[PDB]
Amino acid sequence: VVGGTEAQRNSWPSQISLQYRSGSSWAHTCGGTLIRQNWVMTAAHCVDRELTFRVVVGEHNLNQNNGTEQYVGVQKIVVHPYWNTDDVAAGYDIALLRLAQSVTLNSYVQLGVLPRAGTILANNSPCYITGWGLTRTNGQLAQTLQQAYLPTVDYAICSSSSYWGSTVKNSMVCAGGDGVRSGCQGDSGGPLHCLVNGQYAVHGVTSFVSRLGCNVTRKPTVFTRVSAYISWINNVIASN
Ligand SMILES: [Ca+2]
């Protein structure tokens, strides 16, 4: 997250860290959202490669023991059937991970709330992005969870020639673009929490940013619109 600030520890209990084994150690690669005691929602491009993955819940400081973590393996990766790695702008950047075991829900570990199917947010709605991704374009990962206010930019405006144009589809959600705050590599797969009816729900899964950089004016961070995949998600969890 570029231009953010440290989140109060465990204030976003559904946020998880997706790591892969590198030799004899692990490395944070993406964010994700715990939607079931044994299911995690993330980006398809995060699990595109055949590596060994593990999920960490109740995490805050990646380099220290906060005494609130739980580490569990991934036994099943279900990528959306239409996902095309060579055409991220085509959408479908979403995947579900069945955990090897069920996490225990407590003060630091809670399920994320999903919006109803087809829900579209009004322009400039209040949302927050969270993650351990780069704090600057070509910078380095943050070691403690970061958060930044990232209001939405509706489709009409986001798909215009002044912003993303044809790169963005209606199955996506845009937020930010103020040139100061934004998601960045390492935030991918993570959540976009938006305030609706008094509660925060996960409306997006971080997908991509501009090739020019993370925080670029009029180039909002692009997220997979969760409300467009509700049926798919349920059909997967119901039969797995
Ligand atoms: Ca820790």
UniProtKB/Swiss-Prot annotation:
<dbReference type="GO" id="GO:0004252">
    <property type="term" value="F:serine-type endopeptidase activity"/>
</dbReference>
<feature type="active site" description="Charge relay system">
    <location>
        <position position="93"/>
    </location>
</feature>
<dbReference type="InterPro" id="IPR001314">
    <property type="entry name" value="Peptidase_S1A"/>
</dbReference>
<comment type="function">
    <text>Serine proteases that hydrolyze many proteins in addition to elastin.</text>
</comment>
<dbReference type="InterPro" id="IPR009003">
    <property type="entry name" value="Peptidase_S1_PA"/>
</dbReference>
<keyword id="KW-0106">Calcium</keyword>
<dbReference type="InterPro" id="IPR033116">
    <property type="entry name" value="TRYPSIN_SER"/>
</dbReference>
<dbReference type="InterPro" id="IPR018114">
    <property type="entry name" value="TRYPSIN_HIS"/>
</dbReference>
<dbReference type="InterPro" id="IPR050850">
    <property type="entry name" value="Peptidase_S1_Elastase_sf"/>
</dbReference>
<feature type="binding site">
    <location>
        <position position="64"/>
    </location>
    <ligand>
        <name>Ca(2+)</name>
    </ligand>
</feature>
<keyword id="KW-0645">Protease</keyword>
<dbReference type="GO" id="GO:0005615">
    <property type="term" value="C:extracellular space"/>
</dbReference>
<keyword id="KW-0479">Metal-binding</keyword>
<dbReference type="GO" id="GO:0006508">
    <property type="term" value="P:proteolysis"/>
</dbReference>
<keyword id="KW-1015">Disulfide bond</keyword>
<feature type="disulfide bond">
    <location>
        <begin position="158"/>
        <end position="174"/>
    </location>
</feature>
<dbReference type="Pfam" id="PF00089">
    <property type="entry name" value="Trypsin"/>
</dbReference>
<feature type="domain" description="Peptidase S1">
    <location>
        <begin position="1"/>
        <end position="238"/>
    </location>
</feature>
<dbReference type="GO" id="GO:0046872">
    <property type="term" value="F:metal ion binding"/>
</dbReference>
<dbReference type="InterPro" id="IPR001254">
    <property type="entry name" value="Trypsin_dom"/>
</dbReference>
<feature type="disulfide bond">
    <location>
        <begin position="127"/>
        <end position="194"/>
    </location>
</feature>
<dbReference type="InterPro" id="IPR043504">
    <property type="entry name" value="Peptidase_S1_PA_chymotrypsin"/>
</dbReference>
<keyword id="KW-0964">Secreted</keyword>
<keyword id="KW-0378">Hydrolase</keyword>
<keyword id="KW-0865">Zymogen</keyword>
<feature type="active site" description="Charge relay system">
    <location>
        <position position="188"/>
    </location>
</feature>
<feature type="disulfide bond">
    <location>
        <begin position="184"/>
        <end position="214"/>
    </location>
</feature>
<protein>
    <recommendedName>
        <fullName>Chymotrypsin-like elastase family member 1</fullName>
        <ecNumber>3.4.21.36</ecNumber>
    </recommendedName>
</protein>
<feature type="binding site">
    <location>
        <position position="59"/>
    </location>
    <ligand>
        <name>Ca(2+)</name>
    </ligand>
</feature>
<feature type="binding site">
    <location>
        <position position="69"/>
    </location>
    <ligand>
        <name>Ca(2+)</name>
    </ligand>
</feature>
<keyword id="KW-0720">Serine protease</keyword>
<keyword id="KW-0732">Signal</keyword>
<feature type="binding site">
    <location>
        <position position="61"/>
    </location>
    <ligand>
        <name>Ca(2+)</name>
    </ligand>
</feature>
<comment type="similarity">
    <text>Belongs to the peptidase S1 family. Elastase subfamily.</text>
</comment>
<feature type="disulfide bond">
    <location>
        <begin position="30"/>
        <end position="46"/>
    </location>
</feature>
<feature type="active site" description="Charge relay system">
    <location>
        <position position="45"/>
    </location>
</feature>
